[PDB]
Design a protein around this ligand. Structure first.
Ligand SMILES: [Zn+2]
Lengths: 185, 67, 187, 142, 141, 55, 75, 100
RNA sequence: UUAAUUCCGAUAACGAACGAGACUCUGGCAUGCUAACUAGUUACGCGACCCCGGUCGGCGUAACUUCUUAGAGGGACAAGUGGCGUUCAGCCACCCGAGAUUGAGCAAUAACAGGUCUGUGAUGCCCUUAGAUGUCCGGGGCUGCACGCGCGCUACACUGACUGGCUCAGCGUGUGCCUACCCUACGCCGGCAGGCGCGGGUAACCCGUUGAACCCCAUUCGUGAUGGGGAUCGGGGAUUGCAAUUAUUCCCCAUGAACGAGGAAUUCCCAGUAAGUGCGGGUCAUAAGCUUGCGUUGAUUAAGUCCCUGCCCUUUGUACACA
């Protein structure tokens, strides 16, 4: 039916975004309501074309790195599909709301750089991209020489990011970079 | 960098100064007029000349042209 | 062909045949005013036309050298008797022809003539005939040990582009003295 | 009634497909098989995206025969997805009235362009002096 | 009715292998236990009755695309020829095991030899393929 | 005599069998389409055969 | 340095724990089950097939590599 | 009666002019003729070196070569077809007459 | 202002060309034209099967160019709207539209004490000139090894290791000129290697309708220098050429190390891009860790600048002078 669209088993509704800053860049609502996040490409033409790509497709594409994982999109979509099942059985609430809260919590605002060190703020799109890269890097670093799988590690990182007790890799690096930027200012 | 060239600029002003009567603001009108009066070897050069002729017609409709 | 060889190799063999047929007549008829040959293939008759400047020099004595060249084509490549025929035609507008002026200048500079005056005379002759532009590059040594690349360029001359390959006419000649070998690039 | 034959090709890449429309009962087939044994099962809903938006009423009279050649697998999926969509648009365009065709087209315009219009994305040729098209070899110094 | 193209081919080969195990007259030798499938493969197959799976696959391939010899059978049995430190290539399958599969299926009364090579499937065997397709449809329904 | 040692090594393979027909060098020989011609003279008389650099 | 003594077969206390606590926990995933019970992956999968033959687990999404099972339902 | 004349050429417009002249001659001589069946062309890429010695940067040539194929199907006696093929020959187009 | 001495403009300058622009080949689409029994499509009828209808790359012949192939042309131009800028050259966002940047070739003047005599019966000088620096046969060497680097290939695993099932490409190539050397189809012998006679093709016919790799699905394993790695080594069995050991090449079994994600330093590139992973051509009696094209899946970041390494002009003292 065209009235409701179930992403696997999850509708578009029951998604509340608190931050008005990240809601303008995240464009998964009201336009990109899909069943599967698979696509061909061309989301990097304009300067701000990259924000029009949905965050589920970004989470799909950002996993495949380091040579051997290239060409495993059909692998990682099924991995994220199992990861929703791992998140929902332990949390109970909406995994989309958990992921939105994780993106709200894991935002590194200020960061120093060598130009003395100039501690300045970054873009909200840069915060979203940094959060996605840090969570994918933490999942890839955790799932190495271990029986625990990609979906289980990604689910544990998203649950720790939603909890916010300095356990997740993205939350830990966000607090560390804000500590360094608070120090050298 | 879509700059109209000197081979377009030497031709288009002479074409408008000669056949100023048989012109129009529309692109498809004077695109076929330039095919009649001039001998242009290629379609890309023909379209560049016709676009610069329409731009000169817009300059005429706005005001006086110095050149 | 009776054994019916492949058409992919047939055009390669025909290109080698045309290359050898051009190169042998270029090496042989060079002292008698050679420009080129033209061939239109007909069944059982190989009609070749040597488009030559001096038609009197290529015959020798009532077409004796032509009858020798027919025997050359018959013996070397292999053809039946009467399968090939030659026709001589005079080269028109030889002033703009770059190879015809080059073969005229080469023997004069080999025997003896002024260096600058011959080049200016040929340039004045082709500009009177109606050549658009000319380029004469003479390399090699000139009355010494160190080489010296000469240049005589005037008029309109385009270099790049796609239709320039049939616009201009390029000639490369190599004169062989007893001391050294020099090269002339006529354009 | 008469044989309403509509043959529309779908081309996005090397994988091509030809959709043939007909009147009668509703049975969509791709060389004589439905869309239920597709490997992988992850992209089961991707070919049902034009099915679920229109509904079961629109596919009652429409039955489509698809022949497929070339390409890969997911390229064949996008090829048949574009081909049956353009054949369905041509079927509602040519025979029945234009108002229902516009009502169906207003759904397909808002959702995706890939259903209607293909993009010129092909493989660029490999250049000499590198492992790929853009990348070069490592320069040897000293 | 149903057809074998409407039947999913993942469970169809297992159901036909179960039917050939119910038959059990398809000339199984004793060197199947010690043989390796091809030179690009590394070790022996895991399951012990791996002749009947190849027989079921040969039956459905001769049903769908008839007129095939040794090369069309060695083309489907292929993989990465991992030689070692050298870069890998593609290697064809073995010839004799596919020839013994063809001899066993020719000894069984389900095929018939065709001119210019090949083993086409007889109208008696087409009825059996339709009945086992109905059996798989009744099993899944 | 020397004619016994002349025809002793067979010339039935590789560059011992075939060579260039212009420079007679064992370098840059194309066996494809029956050329048997070195690459320098091929680039020289490449236009007279029919090859041309378009793209 | 470090070597985790993973068990090969069942024991009495591990069998009593698998009979008692496994229907009480919510998520049953084989890596976490092997990590808690200190057992090999083959025995961890075989215990899941034993629970599937017994009939006290619920199948959510089965696969060759990564299985997902739960306990008995509440509502 | 079934004649399959194959026309091979490197040039495009000369081959088109020859086959169009044959079709327009068949219309004047009032015989049954099919249209020009356009067979696909063939390509030959040659990659060689520029420098005779092995010094400097590695160059790579791109020599291209093309060849085409057309055919004209006929249903006519051979005495009419020989009179057509005797007239207006050129060294560009090569004719292969086959009667089967 | 742009990739551009590409244009407005200032005017002791006006008027031209070279390079670029411009021009050629290829791609994105034109259900409007012509054509196809060595490309097909839709149906008619026959045969097989299931229970009035469906299936068939099983067969014979009626319409057609909707797929393929390719002669001819078109459109795409900043044309339309809104902003910046002398309101000039022009620039940016947006609607509609197969595309609001496909790639390559040709590439001005001037020069190197840059390379090539070891490509050349292109060539000057010197030497050799018979016991020859020429020509021919049997071997050796070109591979060699305390050491330092250059170009490449595969692993250090759980994202993985093993076994089957399932499902797709386009470049190509090929019956002889001396000359033997070509693609292989099919039924068999054998675990593989390899062998026996046999039909098709001078090619949109034959290989072939290229069931290629990754992929997805279903079994076995579980943190162990490990089932990953096959570096190292032994025995046997075959093809190639007259002739292989220092292993030409292929097949079977056994041997199971270094390697726990890498220090200083450094190379390439910015959308079907890197990357994973294959297949043709050349080298080919035997011949891919080389090179070039053809395919499949498919990301992160960026729409700025001279801080760092180069190159190109400028003002000017002129220890920079056939420079
Ligand atoms: Zn040479």
């Amino acid at each position: 039916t065209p009235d409701i669209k179930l992403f696997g088993k999850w509708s578009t509704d029951d998604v509340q975004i608190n931050d008005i800053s990240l809601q303008d860049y995240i464009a998964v609502k009201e336009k990109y309501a899909k069943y599967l996040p698979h696509s061909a490409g061309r989301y990097a033409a304009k300067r701000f074309r990259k924000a029009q790509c949905p965050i589920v497709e970004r989470l799909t594409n950002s996993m495949m790195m380091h040579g051997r994982n290239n060409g495993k999109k059909l692998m990682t979509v099924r991995i994220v599909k199992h990861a929703f099942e791992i998140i929902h059985l332990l949390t109970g609430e909406n995994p989309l709301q958990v992921l939105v809260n994780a993106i709200i919590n894991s935002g590194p605002r200020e960061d120093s750089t060598r130009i003395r060190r100039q501690a300045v703020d970054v873009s909200p799109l840069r915060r979203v991209n940094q959060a996605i890269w840090l969570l994918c890097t933490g999942a890839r670093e955790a799932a190495f020489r271990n029986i625990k799988t990609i979906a289980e590690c990604l689910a544990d990182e998203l649950i720790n990011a939603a909890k916010g007790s300095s356990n997740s890799y993205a939350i830990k690096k966000k607090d560390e970079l804000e500590r360094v930027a608070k120090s050298n200012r | 960098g879509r700059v109209r060239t000197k081979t377009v600029k030497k031709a288009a002003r002479v074409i408008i100064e000669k056949y100023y009567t048989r012109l129009g603001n529309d692109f498809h009108t004077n695109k076929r007029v330039c095919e009649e009066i001039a001998i242009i070897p290629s379609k890309k050069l023909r379209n560049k000349i016709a676009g610069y002729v329409t731009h000169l017609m817009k300059r005429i409709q706005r005001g006086p042209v110095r050149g | 062909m009776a054994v019916q060889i492949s058409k992919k190799r047939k055009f390669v063999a025909d290109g080698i045949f045309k290359a050898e047929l051009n190169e042998f007549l270029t090496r042989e008829l060079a002292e008698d005013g050679y420009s080129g040959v033209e061939v239109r293939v007909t069944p059982t008759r190989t009609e070749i036309i040597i488009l030559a400047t001096r038609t009197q020099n290529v015959l020798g004595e009532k077409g004796r050298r032509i009858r020798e060249l027919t025997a050359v084509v018959q013996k070397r490549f292999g053809f039946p008797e009467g399968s090939v025929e030659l026709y001589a035609e005079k080269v028109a507008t030889r002033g703009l022809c770059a190879i015809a002026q080059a073969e005229s200048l080469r023997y004069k500079l080999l025997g003896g003539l002024a260096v600058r005056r011959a080049c200016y005379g040929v340039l004045r002759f082709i500009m009177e005939s109606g050549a658009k532009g000319c380029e004469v590059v003479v390399s090699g040594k000139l009355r010494g040990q160190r080489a010296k690349s000469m240049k005589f360029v005037d008029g309109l001359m385009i270099h790049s582009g796609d239709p320039v390959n049939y616009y201009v006419d390029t000639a490369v000649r190599h004169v062989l003295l007893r001391q050294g070998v020099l090269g002339i690039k006529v354009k | 009634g008469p044989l309403q034959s509509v043959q529309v090709f779908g081309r996005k890449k090397t994988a091509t497909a030809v959709a043939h429309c007909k009147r009668g009962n509703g049975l969509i087939k791709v060389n004589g098989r439905p869309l239920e044994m597709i490997e992988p099962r992850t992209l089961q809903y991707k070919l049902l995206e034009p099915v679920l938006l229109l509904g079961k009423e629109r596919f009652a009279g429409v039955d489509i025969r698809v022949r497929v050649k070339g390409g890969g697998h997911v390229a064949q999926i996008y090829a048949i997805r574009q081909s049956i969509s353009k054949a369905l648009v041509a079927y509602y365009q040519k025979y029945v009235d234009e108002a229902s065709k516009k009502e169906i087209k207003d759904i397909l315009i808002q959702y995706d362009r890939t259903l209607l219009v293909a993009d010129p994305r092909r493989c660029e040729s490999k250049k000499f002096g590198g492992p790929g098209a853009r990348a070069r070899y490592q320069k040897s110094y000293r | 009715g149903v057809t074998v193209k409407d039947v999913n081919q993942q469970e169809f080969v297992r159901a036909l292998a179960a039917f050939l195990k119910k038959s059990g007259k398809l000339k199984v030798p004793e060197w199947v236990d010690t043989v390796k499938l091809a030179k690009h493969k590394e070790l022996a197959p895991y399951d012990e009755n791996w002749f009947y799976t190849r027989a079921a696959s040969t039956a459905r391939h001769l049903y769908l695309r008839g007129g095939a010899g040794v090369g069309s059978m060695t083309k489907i049995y292929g993989g990465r020829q991992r030689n070692g430190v050298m870069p890998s290539h593609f290697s064809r399958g073995s010839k004799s095991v596919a020839r013994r599969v063809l001899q066993a299926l020719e000894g069984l009364k389900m095929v018939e030899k065709d001119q210019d090579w090949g083993r086409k499937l007889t109208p008696q065997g087409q009825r059996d393929l339709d009945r086992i397709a109905g059996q798989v449809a009744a099993a899944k329904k | 005599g020397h004619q016994q040692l002349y025809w002793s090594h067979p010339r039935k393979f590789g560059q011992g069998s075939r060579s260039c027909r212009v420079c007679s060098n064992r370098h840059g020989l194309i066996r494809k389409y029956g050329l048997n011609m070195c690459r320098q003279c091929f680039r020289q008389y490449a236009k007279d055969i029919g090859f041309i650099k378009l793209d | 340095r470090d070597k985790l003594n993973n068990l090969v077969l069942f024991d009495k206390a591990t069998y009593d724990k698998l009979c008692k606590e496994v229907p009480n926990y919510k998520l049953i995933t084989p890596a976490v089950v092997s990590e808690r019970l200190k057992i090999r992956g083959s025995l961890a999968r075989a215990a899941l097939q034993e629970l599937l033959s017994k009939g006290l687990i619920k199948l959510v999404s089965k696969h060759r590599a990564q299985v997902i099972y739960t306990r008995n339902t509440k509502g | 009666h079934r004649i399959r004349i194959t026309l091979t050429s490197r040039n495009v417009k000369s081959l088109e002019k020859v086959c169009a002249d044959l079709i327009r001659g068949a219309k004047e001589k009032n015989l049954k003729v099919k249209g020009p069946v356009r067979m696909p062309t063939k390509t030959l890429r040659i990659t060689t070196r520029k420098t005779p010695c092995g010094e400097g940067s590695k160059t790579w040539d791109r020599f291209q070569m093309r060849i085409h194929k057309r055919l004209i199907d006929l249903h006519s006696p051979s005495e009419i077809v020989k009179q057509i093929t005797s007239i207006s020959i050129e060294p560009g187009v090569e004719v292969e007459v086959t009667i089967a």
